[PDB]
Structure 1
Amino acid sequence: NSVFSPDGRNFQVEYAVKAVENGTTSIGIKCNDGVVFAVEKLITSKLLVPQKNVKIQVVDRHIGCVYSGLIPDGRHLVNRGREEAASFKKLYKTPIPIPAFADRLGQYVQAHTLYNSVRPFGVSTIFGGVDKNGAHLYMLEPSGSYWGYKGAATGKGRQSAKAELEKLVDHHPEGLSAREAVKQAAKIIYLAHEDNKEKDFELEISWCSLSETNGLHKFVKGDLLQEAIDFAQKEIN
């Protein structure tokens, strides 16, 4: 961890990335007034209760987080993000800006790459929301590296997901609505699942949109979800 290789690399972090790649695929899409988050939930057995192992997490009221890799490591990161968002709001009264929040997580993840008594996190996290000046979407690697994204994907289906995302950025340079971005997220998760077709899966979507949710993080449920599932089932065939 605190150990540089002879050519400046950190093998432990590179190994942590492998745990991420081994993970279920998750994505985020930035629309013209918000952000959408989707994730692939592997159905190991019929015994798993449908809708009841929620992966996507809220931080404060305006932020969604999704991750691939070691699920517990992600929860650990979200706990910290919640303490970090509360601390900001307590002192500054305003809810934490998305970039502000990004760095909070970043610095925390980076700290776990400084010391021999600690391991890096075994997750990549896709997160974001709406603040004072618009939508923001971020992705954060085990090294603590993070940037803003137009669209992002991580986990096993990452390469095909990135390909689909890249197409959308080309076909819609003029923004792209929250309602479309939800549909398209369901699509991309379905296409990314192609790899794992041996086991069945469940789809989870959340969104935070200025006009559709009033800038609050909200889970996509009911008819809106079914409509997005129907669109993905249609466009896969």
Structure 2
Amino acid sequence: FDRHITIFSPEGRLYQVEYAFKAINQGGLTSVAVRGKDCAVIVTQKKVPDKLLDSSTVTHLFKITENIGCVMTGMTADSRSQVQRARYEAANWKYKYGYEIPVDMLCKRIADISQVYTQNAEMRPLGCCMILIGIDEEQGPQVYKCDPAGYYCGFKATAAGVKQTESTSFLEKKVKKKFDWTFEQTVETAITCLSTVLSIDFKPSEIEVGVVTVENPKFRILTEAEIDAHLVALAER
């Protein structure tokens, strides 16, 4: 009914697609991906509100293949569903086509699926954001992000969530000043960015970092001792 389903407004807008980005902000959580010379990291925060909850199960970092990882931001069940669909499309690319799916092709595929939600009126847009990282064989580190509108793009760095705009301002002042690279700095840039806009001076039980490197393209989820090894190195400077 022109603002209830995904049809055009008189000025050409899709209001349910606009409200899915409001729904991403409902989670309260901000994710940041930055990209280095031979590395691409994803950092999100790990606010665990209930203390008798198993914190090893609350995670927004997801393995898609061995070489491709993923941080999700938004409505959490929508996020797990879009992760299962990405895992399906990755395995089916490998089966049909005989090689591992590129990060741009997976992110393009998930955005192509999201367009269908934005165009058929009987289902809603799936109100969450996927950021895919992974190492391309010919292009190096790739950071791709698809939104509930069905857009995707490649990103020198990006952010998703509540403090997305200020994280974008931080990283945008950052990447025109330096060419941020090296394994250590790129985790530094993605920890400082999250910390600056949340302003809460991290302890490692509170964020979680996922990396890919060109030297080992396996998607790793950082150990809490390793987030300590970055937070101590960042917190004395």
TM-score after normalising by structure 1:
0.89
Is the Cα–Cα contact under 8 Å of residues 139 and 148 in structure 1 kept in the other structure? yes
Is the Cα–Cα contact under 8 Å of residues 48 and 58 in structure 2 kept in the other structure? no
2:109 to 104, 110, 113: 104
Which residue in 1 is equivalent to 2:9? 5
Which residue in 2 is equivalent to 1:35? 40
CA distance in 2 between counterparts of 1:44 and 1:232 reads: 26
2:186 to 168, 181, 185: 181
After superposition, the Cα gap between the structure-2 partners of 1:14 and 1:25, relative to the gap in structure 1 and judged at 3 Å, is same
Which residue in 1 is equivalent to 2:88? 83
Is the Cα–Cα contact under 8 Å of residues 160 and 191 in structure 1 kept in the other structure? no
Which residue in 2 is equivalent to 1:115? 120
Does residue 1:125 correspond to 2:127, yes or no? Answer: no
Structure 1: gaps (5+ residues): none
1:137 to 128, 137, 143: 143
TM-score after normalising by structure 2:
0.89
Following TM superposition, by how much is the alpha carbon of 1:225 offset from its aligned partner in structure 2, in angstroms?
Answer: 1.3
Following TM superposition, by how much is the alpha carbon of 1:162 offset from its aligned partner in structure 2, in angstroms?
Answer: 1.3
Following TM superposition, by how much is the alpha carbon of 1:233 offset from its aligned partner in structure 2, in angstroms?
Answer: 4.3
Is the Cα–Cα contact under 8 Å of residues 25 and 192 in structure 1 kept in the other structure? no
Kindly provide the CA deviation profile for residues 178-199 of structure 1, in whole angstroms up to 9, marking residues without a partner as x: 22211222222222223x89xx
Does residue 1:164 correspond to 2:134, yes or no? Answer: no
Which residue in 2 is equivalent to 1:66? 71
Q: Percent identity among equivalent residues?
A: 29
CA distance in 1 between counterparts of 2:105 and 2:48 reads: 36
CA distance in 1 between counterparts of 2:189 and 2:109 reads: 30
Does residue 1:53 correspond to 2:67, yes or no? Answer: no
Amino acid at match of 1:58: K
Following TM superposition, by how much is the alpha carbon of 1:78 offset from its aligned partner in structure 2, in angstroms?
Answer: 0.9
Which residue in 2 is equivalent to 1:207? 211
CA distance in 2 between counterparts of 1:59 and 1:10 reads: 30
CA distance in 1 between counterparts of 2:213 and 2:230 reads: 17
Q: CA RMSD in A?
A: 1.9
Please identify, of 47-56 and 74-83, the stretch whose mean Cα deviation from structure 2 is larger.
Answer: 47-56
CA distance in 2 between counterparts of 1:2 and 1:70 reads: 19
Give the aligned length.
Answer: 228
CA distance in 2 between counterparts of 1:178 and 1:33 reads: 8
CA distance in 1 between counterparts of 2:26 and 2:233 reads: 28
CA distance in 2 between counterparts of 1:53 and 1:21 reads: 18
Structure 2: gaps (5+ residues): none
